[PDB]
Amino acid sequence: AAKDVKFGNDARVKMLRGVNVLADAVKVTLGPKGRNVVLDKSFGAPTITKDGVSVAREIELEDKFENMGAQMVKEVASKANDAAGDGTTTATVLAQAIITEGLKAVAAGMNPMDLKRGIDKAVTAAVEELKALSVPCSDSKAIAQVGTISANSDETVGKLIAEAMDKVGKEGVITVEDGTGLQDELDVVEGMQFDRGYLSPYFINKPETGAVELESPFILLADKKISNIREMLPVLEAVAKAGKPLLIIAEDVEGEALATLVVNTMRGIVKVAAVKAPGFGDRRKAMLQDIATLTGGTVISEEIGMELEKATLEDLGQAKRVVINKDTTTIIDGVGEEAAIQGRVAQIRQQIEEATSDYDREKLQERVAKLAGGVAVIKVGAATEVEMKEKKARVEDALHATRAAVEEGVVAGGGVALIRVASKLADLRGQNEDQNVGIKVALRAMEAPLRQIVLNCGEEPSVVANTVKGGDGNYGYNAATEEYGNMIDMGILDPTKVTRSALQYAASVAGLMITTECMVTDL
Amino acid sequence: AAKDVKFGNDARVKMLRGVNVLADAVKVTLGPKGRNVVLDKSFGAPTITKDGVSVAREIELEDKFENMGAQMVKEVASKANDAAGDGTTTATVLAQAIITEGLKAVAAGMNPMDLKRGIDKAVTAAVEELKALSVPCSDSKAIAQVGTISANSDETVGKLIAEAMDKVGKEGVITVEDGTGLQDELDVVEGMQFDRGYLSPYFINKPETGAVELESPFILLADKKISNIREMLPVLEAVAKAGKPLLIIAEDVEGEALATLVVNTMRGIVKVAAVKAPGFGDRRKAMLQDIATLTGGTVISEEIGMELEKATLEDLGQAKRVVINKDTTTIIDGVGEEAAIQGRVAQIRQQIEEATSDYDREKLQERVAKLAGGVAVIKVGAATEVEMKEKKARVEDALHATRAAVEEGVVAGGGVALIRVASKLADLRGQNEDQNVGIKVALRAMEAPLRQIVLNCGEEPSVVANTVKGGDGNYGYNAATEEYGNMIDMGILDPTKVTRSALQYAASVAGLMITTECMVTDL
Amino acid sequence: AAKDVKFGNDARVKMLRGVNVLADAVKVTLGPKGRNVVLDKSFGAPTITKDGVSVAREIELEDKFENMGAQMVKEVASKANDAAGDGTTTATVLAQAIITEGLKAVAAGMNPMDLKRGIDKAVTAAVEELKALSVPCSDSKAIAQVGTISANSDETVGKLIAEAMDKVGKEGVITVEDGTGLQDELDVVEGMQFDRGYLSPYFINKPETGAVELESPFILLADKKISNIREMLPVLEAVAKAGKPLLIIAEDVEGEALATLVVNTMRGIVKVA
Amino acid sequence: AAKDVKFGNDARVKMLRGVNVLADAVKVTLGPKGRNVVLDKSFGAPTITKDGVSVAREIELEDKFENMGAQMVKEVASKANDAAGDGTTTATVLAQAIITEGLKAVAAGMNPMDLKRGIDKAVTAAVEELKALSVPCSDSKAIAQVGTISANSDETVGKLIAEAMDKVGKEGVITVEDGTGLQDELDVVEGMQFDRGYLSPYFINKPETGAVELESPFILLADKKISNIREMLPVLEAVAKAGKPLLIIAEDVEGEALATLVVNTMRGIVKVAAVKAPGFGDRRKAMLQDIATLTGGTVISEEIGMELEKATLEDLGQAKRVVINKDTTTIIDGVGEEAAIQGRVAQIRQQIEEATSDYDREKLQERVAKLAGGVAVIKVGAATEVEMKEKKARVEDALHATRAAVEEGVVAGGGVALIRVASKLADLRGQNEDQNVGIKVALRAMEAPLRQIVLNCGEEPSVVANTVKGGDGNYGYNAATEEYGNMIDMGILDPTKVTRSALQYAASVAGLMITTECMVTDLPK
Ligand SMILES: Nc1ncnc2c1ncn2[C@@H]1O[C@H](COP(=O)(O)OP(=O)(O)OP(=O)(O)O)[C@@H](O)[C@H]1O
Ligand SMILES: Nc1ncnc2c1ncn2[C@@H]1O[C@H](COP(=O)(O)OP(=O)(O)OP(=O)(O)O)[C@@H](O)[C@H]1O
Ligand SMILES: Nc1ncnc2c1ncn2[C@@H]1O[C@H](COP(=O)(O)OP(=O)(O)OP(=O)(O)O)[C@@H](O)[C@H]1O
Fold first, then answer.
1. Helices (H), chain C
2. In 3-state terms, what secondary structure has residue D42?
3. d(Cα D6, Cα D19) in Å, to the nearest integer?
4. What is the H or E stretch that residue A520 is in?
């Protein structure tokens, strides 16, 4: 295709206009005074959201160069949300600040590569500073605060997630799903979780979240890979009139002899899914036995001799709900038999007691933790479908923030930690004055979150920025109550991982992206 | 198609406008102060790169004549990257200089093919001069410098590749692949390398790099060609529900009874690849036996009598990663059995000990070198996908540059050695005054790299060119530290092959290219 | 009126277009086999000429840049004409060749004023060499042939110029008049010549001729400046009573007297030169 | 006519476009290797010139904003011309460099007026540095060289002006005239000069010349205001009966008399040129008495009683020639007796002796200087009237540049003065980063003329610039012979005053137009 090619300042200004559009569209959602935005959906109702990443995904400009810049910054939100699930808006704001100031410097005549290297030096120094300043998160009150603040100062969901992590432990799995009443409910039912994903991206359902859900699925388990379609056709055939969608768990699933002809055979009324089995050998076999007992099913093996053609509907497992994601797949509620589940739990506990090898002990302890923790289910209760998915977004963001906080720790909320590390990093210098200018641009950039939150409050940013810079420790500006105080006392806290990942991704993409002079695109 | 035909100066100026667009878009990436570009991608995120040859590949102009010029100079970068993998930007810059000055001479009325002969005489003299001035590369410090400078003065990757060539020797194979952490990692694992390529260009995966990759492939080996599809259908059928993609190694693979119906069978969910077996007869059989033992597989033969229908999933080989390229195909990691691999290594060593024929000894020594060197794997660790591929590009460029340097030698970096050989060639004269002016055009063109690098630094190109021309030996201008000194001492060195190939390709295409009077295109 | 600028090679190719237009339009008629060129007239029949000056006079192009290039070459052609009297086609043909090759060379990237200096040196050498190659024309026969060739190969004109040349010697003065008879009339009468032009171009009675021809005029001789026309009022009254053309020779003529004389000339009451 | 506004960076880029247009159009002809520029005339042949003033005069753009930018740079060029007389191309080239880097820097988000203050500080330091580096031009050989270079490398003109100052000393008054002979003529005749211009621009007989040149006029001296033209009615009648040009010198001229004189001049019935009365009070009256002695005239005053109406042809002064400049009037070969002039010289010398006030003593000293020194006349000699007037113009601006040189000093030409000063000022800093970048913009802009003239040579600007920077003292690049050396040795010099004024007004207009945010203009119609 014939290419329009732009050089230097023209390319950079088209880039920056597109990036400014996207960053405004995302930054209008930041902070407790953050304001939700409407994303058009052609198939259904318009979607309200405070979730930055879905927004940033939805932007696509008409001018090709502006669109390219917007895609480059959409990468920031995508990477940030995948890493942490929160702070994508923060990452985008840090981006926009860094690109704007770096482009001003470059327009002055600056070398962009030295800016890049200075930005890297400053951002790594900031990573070390936040690691020094990170505080462990505990007491179930800090976690509740993280959830509440993450959900736009929603105390009910913060309390609910605090109760959930109290019950299932700091490492238990919690699932957010559609509720039925007007109230959000907690349902900790028996379930299972294994770190595997779908084999083919054609199993993605109508929702664009990337996780496919099954309405009362039918569980099939296997450790030995079958050979021909005809051996597993009767099971499908039985499934084809069982009533319930089929999820198969195997060591590794092909595309040729399953996916192509299940797509060509079925138009998609009732879905069929196939997933990998984590582990290998005896560990995988024991895990499959545990899953089969949880779902009331059985595991086919060469040694047993029981075959797929002999397998019936009652022999195999069944679950009440199953959600499959690329990162990790969970069976939400497998009915099975409660007495059988308890007997298997006792058997695996005695397996722990007899075992003495460190690897065997730790994997069996992982098994008992998975069985005992269960799955917490969040029934998002609200009046409407728009409020359904909006509250789902805020609840999932709160859950992800709590996860990251217990993974790494917490620091002062509202970007105050950025102010403090910027004050601490004022002395960092680069190889030359060029790298010093880059570090100073990064310094100027890290107060962007506070300024943008205060702007979302309608208050003037520079006043608050200087007021916090005059402060120290955990003194900052509660935007919700429009007053200065200690966040740690009042519970405005960010997870350390969220902040660190956001700043890291933003610095990396911005440093690459301000060094760009030739832009080549279709006309 | 109706042809618009342009003659003489208007044709040549449209040509030159297109060439100038492409050459600017490539030359903005040269040197340590070289600055990255953005190439659009329709399927995914925009690609920020410093790789000049890619920049050449995605340039196409709206005016047909300008598009011709751009394509004919894109040929330069393609040929240069194929030959050496670095210096494509240098080749394009030498082109643009030569075409512009030759067009000025032709606009004066000067005869084109005598200019061509003068250019060839000068460029062959320059080849001999650089061969005289080439210095062998060794000590693992010069290699590290070549890698670092090749990767835009990136010292960490230079140290890493120095360690890699220290471990796997100066001739071992090194693979660059996607990493997982934020850090670039070195993983020297057991693998195989053999100079063979894919049979059909329809096996090219989604990446446009031309090398297909397989995630957990399944290895099949053969020395006797099967006859019918039905004999090898069960293996495929077994593969069709094995879980892993199938790579077949054979003497020579057909298209009629494999490729057509394997494209018609699968839609591209899981790939199936077939490659040629290097060598012939007993050498090919021994290589297949070695590869089957490396992957834990077996080789089908008429003498053995074991048949494809009798072959099972456990009988055949399996690898962790395999990347197939047209030039050379490598199995990155075949698990197999470490004890079996060591036993095969000892057996082949004893085969060396018993053998005395020079050809047998050298091929068995090639076998033991391939087995002992293994495969070095570079896990490109970075924050983002854009930084994934950008760091991959710079690391691969460093790899190719180090390969070329150890293949042929090194000279002064930044074109300083090219300046020196230009100074040494001031006395070369052609058959007539026309050829003399052609030689002088080549002479005035060979200072293009230094000028363009210094311009990328934003500095005064003329003072640097004159200062270096006043200098001698390895005295030149470090662009990174903006100062004049000895390149050998400060480690800025080019591979001799890269520079020689760039100048040869550029001179050939440019002299052949400035002779063009008529241009015939679609309207 | 605002001004539109054009700088760079685009301007150069523009006056190149203009000079090519004018230069071809005038070079067609060069030589004895010079082809006719027809020129429109606002009224009546269009004139048909082989005169390079005549065709070169009215060349003026619609767009301003090539018009201005045509005007520069028109300037040099008329300057050579007033310097020499002939060979204007030759001058502008030489101009076309030199400018075309010069613009080709400067567009080829050489230094323009270095080129100009080289051309100046070459043309100076050509000038001195043509002094070396020059041959005296003191003979009346070559005078007859050159007068013939200049006047469109008319031997009668060259012959008459030869006889007049013999009449007034080497540095005499020859003046053309109109004869009522079908034969040309050659005479020698004492007269006065001095290199002085008219105060105003409006004094010319015949615009095509370019000179003021007066028959039996009263001649006034003055060595003083005519600052006021009141000094010329009795002179005008006397010459109007007598009824003949009037010629004035004075040291200087100021704006007032010149303006009043111009007004009187366009009135049609007196003939004053 | 309605008014359209454009504020913000759009206005900035707009006048940047305008100044780039005009600045290139004038920078092409800079230097001895300056390329020709062709300009259309509404009638006849187009003019071809190397004069920066000429090309800069008729630049105006179709759209209003860049036209305005062109007009600011035009007015600064003309202001420097009237201040100095030469180097207008230099001033506007410096203007282009300073404004382009300044607008680039302000568009980079930093404070424009911090930048302007920094540029002002840097240019003030440059002014004091060039004062330090200025060399006296008392030597007649350097005077001949600078007169040569100013008048397009014509050694004859510089030589003639050199002998002119040899005739009338260091601070004498010299007027160029037209000589009928092919040879140049030089004479010295006692005359008058004073800093007074015409009442109306319509008094100028030659619009291209800009001055009123009159031969053998009747001169009227008055110390009173001409409120009514009825006072000038008998004078007009007498001068119309006599038939010569008329000069009026009066204290003030009101609107009525000026309008009536303008009507009379455009009628074509009389030649009347009126100028103000120079000086003030008793000094003005005394020097008007001196002028009356020089021309044989009489001073008319209301306080004395004798009025403008009671004027005869004998009472008015007379002279052989007069030239009334734009703000100056000079009288050559006055009729009045030299003995009376010598007596007046003695009287004002005794006034000097009895003078006690320094101001009055200096006024009497300049009175005796102008009354005794006289005026040199240089009559240009040539064959053609066209080259007559062209060499006359070359003499005019060459001598004006020579006077600028004599008043202040001379430095090596070719812009290397600016190059050396920029070398000596690399160390100065400002109060913040924006003042520092303003200093840097001024520094790297004041080096532009060398690069532009080398461009005009056809060579590479940067190599010559850095080589001359490396060279120290008066070492630089002869553009004429296109080779290095000392320009003093080969006589390539520029007056200190012209370059100093050029850079001063360039920095002034840059500081004023950098700080342009709102740009109002009339509507496109
Ligand atoms: N009362 C408050 N005072 C100060 N900062 C607050 C307050 N409430 C919330 N914040 C800050 O607002 C941010 C949370 O807002 P929000 O969840 O909308 O965006 P995010 O965490 O940057 O990312 P995302 O777009 O994924 O939601 C955190 O930085 C938190 O510290
Ligand atoms: N500090 C430096 N000083 C001088 N030259 C340098 C310096 N750093 C790098 N170079 C030169 O820059 C070039 C490497 O730049 P780069 O890798 O972008 O381009 P390339 O090698 O010409 O080709 P390609 O487009 O394939 O990368 C080499 O010629 C190297 O000598
Ligand atoms: N031989 C020379 N070598 C180098 N520079 C020279 C030489 N002769 C003159 N110059 C420089 O060239 C400039 C003279 O340019 P030019 O004669 O076109 O007019 P100007 O003085 O710049 O201005 P104006 O427009 O008022 O005529 C001066 O800056 C002078 O120093």
1. 9-27, 52-57, 64-84, 88-107, 112-133, 140-150, 155-168, 233-242, 255-267
2. coil
3. 17
4. strand A518-522
Distance CA D280, CA D299 (A): 14
d(CA A1, CA B58): 9
Residue A188 in contact with residue A163, Cβ under 8 Å?
no
CATH architecture, domain defined by D1-134+410-524: Orthogonal Bundle (1.10)
**B342-354: string of b/e by CB count within 10 Å (b at 16+)?**
eebbeebeeebee
Q: Which one is the CATH code of B1-134+410-523: 3.40.1190.10, 2.160.20.10, 1.10.560.10, 3.30.70.80?
A: 1.10.560.10
| d(C-alpha A140, C-alpha A160), whole Å | 11
Q: Residue C107 gets which letter from DSSP?
A: H
Is D463 part of the contact surface with chain B (CB cutoff 8 Å)? Answer: yes
Specify binding-site residues of B for ATP.
29-32, 50, 86-90, 414, 478-480, 494
In this structure, the residue with its CA closest to atom 29 of ligand 1 is A414
If one counts every other C-beta atom within 10 angstroms of the C-beta of residue A358, the result is 8
Q: Which residues lie closer than 8 Å to B162 by C-beta, 6 or more apart? A: B140, B141, B143, B144, B147
Residue D322 DSSP label: E
Query: Any idea which residue has 């456990």 for tokens?
Result: B314
Give CA–CA dist A381/D309, Å, rounded.
110
State the Cα–Cα distance between residues A117 and B207, nearest whole angstrom.
29
How many Cβ pairs closer than 8 A exist between chain B and C?
12
Q: How far is the CA of D417 from the centre of ligand 3 (A)?
A: 13
- Which of B463, B464, B469, B477 should be substituted to probe chain D, the one whose Cβ sees the most D Cβ atoms within 10 Å? B463
The alpha-carbon radius of gyration of chain D (Å, integer) is: 26
Domain A191-371 has CATH 3.50.7.10: yes
Domain ranges of chain A: 1-134+410-523, 135-190+372-409, 191-371
- Classified as helix, coil or strand, A61 is coil
Spatial contact of D467 and D423, defined as CB atoms under 8 Å apart: no
Q: Name the minimum distance, in Å, from the CA of A64 to any CA of chain B.
A: 9
Q: For ligand 1, what atom is nearest to the CA of residue A498?
A: 21
Judged by phi (left if over 0) then psi (alpha if -120 to 50, else beta), residue A94 lies in alpha
Residues having CB closer than 6 A to ligand 1 are: A 29-32, 34, 50-52, 86-90, 149-150, 153, 397, 413-415, 453, 478-480, 492, 494
Length of chain D: 525
The tokens describing B290, both together, are: 């070695």
Tokens in use for B299? Answer: 């080789």
How far is D150 from D134, CA to CA, in rounded Å?
18
What spacing in Å lies between the alpha carbon of A137 and ligand 1's midpoint?
17
Residues 6+ apart with CB under 8 A from B232: B226, B308
Length of chain A: 523
* Inter-chain residue contact C72 with D48, CB threshold 8 Å: yes
Which pair of tokens denotes residue B328?
């050379």
Phi first, then psi: give them for residue A215, nearest 5 degrees.
Answer: -85, 105
Dist. CA B279–CA B283, nearest whole Å: 6
| Of D386, D374, D273, nearest in space to D326 by CA | D273
| Exp. method | cryo-EM
Does B89 sit in the ligand 2 pocket, CB within 6 Å?
Answer: yes
Query: In CATH, which superfamily holds the domain spanning D135-190+372-409?
Result: TCP-1-like chaperonin intermediate domain (3.30.260.10)
Alpha-carbon span B159 to B141, nearest angstrom: 9
Task: For B409-458, give the secondary structure using H, E and C.
Answer: CEEECCCHHHHHHHHHCCCCCCCCHHHHHHHHHHHHHCCHHHHHHHHHCC
**CA B216 to CA B213: how far, in whole Å?**
10
Which of C68, C111, C255 is nearest residue D46 as measured by Cβ atoms? C68
Calpha distance A394→A154 (Å, rounded): 9
